[PDB]
Nucleic acid binder design. Structure first.
Ligand code: MG
Ligand code: MG
Ligand code: MG
Ligand code: MG
Ligand code: MG
Ligand code: MG
Ligand code: MG
Ligand code: MG
Ligand code: MG
Ligand code: MG
Ligand code: MG
Ligand code: MG
Ligand code: MG
Ligand code: MG
Ligand code: MG
Ligand code: MG
Ligand code: MG
Ligand code: MG
Ligand code: MG
Ligand code: MG
Ligand code: MG
Ligand code: MG
Ligand code: MG
Ligand code: MG
Ligand code: MG
Ligand code: MG
Ligand code: MG
Lengths: 36, 151, 146
RNA sequence: UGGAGGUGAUUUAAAUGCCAAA
RNA sequence: GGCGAAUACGUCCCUGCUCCUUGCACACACCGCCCGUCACUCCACCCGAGCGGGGCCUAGGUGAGGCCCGAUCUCCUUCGGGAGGUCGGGUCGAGCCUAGGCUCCGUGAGGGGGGAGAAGUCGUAACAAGGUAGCCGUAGGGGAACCUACGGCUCGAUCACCUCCU
RNA sequence: GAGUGGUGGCCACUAUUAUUGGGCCUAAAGCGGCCGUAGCCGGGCCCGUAAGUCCCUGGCGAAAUCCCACGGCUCAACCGUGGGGCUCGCUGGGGAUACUGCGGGCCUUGGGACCGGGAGAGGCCGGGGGUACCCCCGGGGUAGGGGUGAAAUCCUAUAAUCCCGGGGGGACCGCCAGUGGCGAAGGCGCCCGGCUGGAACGGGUCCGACGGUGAGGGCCGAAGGCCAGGGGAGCGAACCGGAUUAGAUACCCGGGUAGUCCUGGCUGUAAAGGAUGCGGGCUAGGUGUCGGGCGAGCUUCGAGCUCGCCCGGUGCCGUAGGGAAGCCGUUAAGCCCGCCGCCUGGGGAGUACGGCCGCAAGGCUGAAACUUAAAGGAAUUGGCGGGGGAGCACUACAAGGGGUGGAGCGUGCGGU
RNA sequence: GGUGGGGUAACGGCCCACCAAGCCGAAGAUCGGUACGGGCCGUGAGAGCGGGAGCCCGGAGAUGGACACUGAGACACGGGUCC
């Protein structure tokens, strides 16, 4: 992914690391359904 | 700065501004040419001949005498050697770089994991290619001449 | 960052290329050249439109304001799309009946969009059955056909 | 006087903000 | 008014208040601020079985009509020929049919996150050393914010010691 | 003011598209690092040419439209006669040579080559070691050891913890050690030997502009992960138990698989940060430290010590100047000459669709509908902290004396 | 692109027969999108940015797609033929 160091600031949002993990989990499911 | 390392060394020679040879110098032009030919026949490099002439015979650079045959230019060691047919076929710095590259390649055959030394080889070959382009432009090398390490 | 480049006398092509390249980062230029507004505009570039009323609704104001704003759903004659139009005035909703025809135009907010404390509404009613709504609100005129 | 680094440690548990301001 | 003691001559441990210094995403001033899942309402969008309808390329077949060259026929000739019908040959050709491949529009069972709203719910992850310092990369685990391991940064508080400077 | 308001579009506002004329340490923005092809930018002198460039002059670029004076409709708008401009573009000739281009000649300052005495955890290969830790065997001794805020799981009469004599194994190199050294960056620390890369200083040595940057392209690249074959001491994702808690999928405790280590490949990612791209010239001083050279003085004569100056690295304080400020300040974030990369309010979103690469995990490239009035930075005054320091109080404690909370009743309050 | 012809008012791969492997392209070919071109017009201190219906000059069309007769000139808006 591309870097947005502004997203790492914690004021008014959750941690960027776990958002990235959640997005990567979401993208796996779409890829699996595409192969079917 | 340096071509690759980007350092700023300043060491070098500081030649005073002068035109005529000094009074205390007693050698004539012919003696100097004979000395140069003798030293070349002993097997020295062009840069080494001038060093010996300066250190031992008390002769500052031979670029203080006009060329007796061509009055429009001054004398240099390479021109003196050309006047007798002892000049190198390949320019000396190119030959030295090629010689350094050949020795390093056979080291890297027994040490394939020496990655830091390999970058030195790449830089050396970059210098070689710059020089060969320049010498092709001026006509000092044949147009078909090519550098191949496998040779 | 060094000096701005290129500055050479014979470097016109690169300079023109650079200026063209970075002009696409301007959002106003991009929307005009690619014609993005015309692709999604329900009014199809017109300043006004005519439609038929389907039903009456009310929308709550945003915080920290309080109140209900009276609006209508309008189906456009020219393409059949359905939009929402605000009815300006005090008690103006009483002059609107279902199945009437109305003329609507932009509401006049920033960037050609919504305004005030009612986002989501982009249009307002101007005429009802070919009679000015402002007159009806003030008086001076009666709504035709009862 | 004022600064910049390094190594150590740092004794239980302790969540929340309604009413009102309107 | 009568009668008339015990203990301490201290400390900031508990409850609090004053001043110096330091951190702060707080100023309604920590009774502050603030995050995510599940439930409810509305809006735009994505994937998508099926279902219809259009447009382009190809390949094959067919082909109104046009032109040219032959043979023959009918009627007029100022005898030079002209006007046309029928058959044969060659060539060009709009359109039409079949098959294949790309592409557009309308519906669409089912699935997915996004944005507003205001509170139905469970917790308290971030801001002070936020009560386990916070954050980046990679990997595993968990109702949900999150937790753990290896390498990194200071955009980390307090005490003791050490080191290097002005 | 016979007009005056609403809606949509273009220019200006806007130096929010910047040639004139913007930005990129902390606010959006310098590729993780380097090598190099095209392009762009390129040191000094002499001779020639005349393509670029400048001057003069012929042939052209319709009219209408624009500007000026005069003239006709009452003046004007409008129209006519003259003078300019516009279509900035083309073409035939003549003249000049400062700059750029092209051809020839001559240089040494930038860059490269070579020689000398030295410096350094730069890299690869072989050998030899240092304590420490774990397991096994033998001797002594006997009831606990371990661990926490407090405990428990766990180990121990098959003799543990602790002490002594032996055998085996895998990883790692303490103090000295230093805003010290080396490397393009990632990174590099036991000792002896071999091979090898780069840099600084000293230089009347050699070549003679051979240079800077670099779209496409190439090579290197912490940890983790994957594919085959080994190894496995200690530590330790997942997992299994003991606790804490309202719950505790955690923090704390006892165990433990992958992994961490070696050989051959793949992946190409970090707060890969000096959050600061690289080359050149110039613009006060002061003071430490590392390498080389020079001078002077000491000396146990040491590759030793002290002081001064030059060059190159590495820190601190600071003048002019710069900046929103924090601050930077010859190691610039100052003034000037170059080249490439990137940014254009906050979200949606580094997402959807398409393409390339990879065994996989994943990498590079990258929108729109819609939504929103701020998001973001530096600094100020207060209030607060399960931050530090100093002080104080029987509506605080500590040392004491007497009580209230249980019963009946007096009186006040909520509720009914 | 060459050689030899045909056809045209006329030069030409405009069209044929034969001989070669050429031509264009990261200084953007090919393909896709959107548009008649210019003199001019709107705005701005200028450098620029945006438009090009109405008047003049040039191009193209006559419901869509093809094709001919007459003539100096047409494949003809108020002439002809087919789908
Ligand atoms: Mg506030
Ligand atoms: Mg709270
Ligand atoms: Mg917390
Ligand atoms: Mg915490
Ligand atoms: Mg876990
Ligand atoms: Mg504006
Ligand atoms: Mg700006
Ligand atoms: Mg930023
Ligand atoms: Mg960088
Ligand atoms: Mg960076
Ligand atoms: Mg020059
Ligand atoms: Mg000229
Ligand atoms: Mg004119
Ligand atoms: Mg008059
Ligand atoms: Mg007049
Ligand atoms: Mg006139
Ligand atoms: Mg024993
Ligand atoms: Mg380069
Ligand atoms: Mg680092
Ligand atoms: Mg220095
Ligand atoms: Mg300073
Ligand atoms: Mg894809
Ligand atoms: Mg009390
Ligand atoms: Mg007490
Ligand atoms: Mg009582
Ligand atoms: Mg146009
Ligand atoms: Mg008209």
């Amino acid at each position: 992914m591309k870097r947005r160091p502004r997203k790492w600031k914690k004021k008014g949002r959750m941690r960027w690391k776990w958002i990235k993990k959640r997005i990567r989990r979401l993208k796996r499911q779409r890829k699996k359904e595409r192969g079917l | 700065a340096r071509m690759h390392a980007r350092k700023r060394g300043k060491s070098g020679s500081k030649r005073p501004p002068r035109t005529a040879p000094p009074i205390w110098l007693e050698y004539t032009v012919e003696d100097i040419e004979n000395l140069v030919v003798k030293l070349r026949k002993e097997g020295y490099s062009t840069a080494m001949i001038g060093t010996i002439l300066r250190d031992q015979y008390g002769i500052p650079t031979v670029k203080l005498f006009r060329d007796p045959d061509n009055p429009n230019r001054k004398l240099t060691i390479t021109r003196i050697l050309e006047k007798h047919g002892l000049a190198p076929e390949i320019p000396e710095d190119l030959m030295f770089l090629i010689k350094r590259a050949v020795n390093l390649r056979k080291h890297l055959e027994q040490h394939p994991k020496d990655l830091h030394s390999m970058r030195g080889l790449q830089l050396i070959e970059s210098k070689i290619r710059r020089l060969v382009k320049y010498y092709k432009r001026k006509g000092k090398l044949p147009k078909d001449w090519r550098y191949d390490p496998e040779q | 960052p060094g000096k701005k480049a290129p500055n050479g006398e014979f470097a016109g092509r690169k300079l023109k290329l650079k200026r063209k390249k970075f002009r696409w980062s301007d959002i106003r230029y991009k929307r005009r050249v690619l014609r993005l507004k015309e692709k999604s505009d329900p009014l199809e570039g017109a300043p006004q439109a005519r439609g038929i009323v389907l039903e009456k609704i009310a929308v709550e104001a945003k915080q920290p304001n309080s109140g209900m704003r009276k609006a209508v759903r309008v189906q456009l004659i020219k393409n059949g799309k359905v939009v929402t139009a605000f009815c300006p005035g005090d008690g103006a909703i009483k002059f609107i009946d279902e199945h009437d025809e109305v003329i609507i135009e932009g509401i006049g907010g920033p960037k050609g969009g919504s305004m005030g404390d009612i986002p989501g509404i982009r249009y307002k009613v101007v005429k009802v059955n070919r009679v000015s709504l402002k007159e009806l609100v003030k008086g001076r005129k009666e709504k035709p056909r009862r």
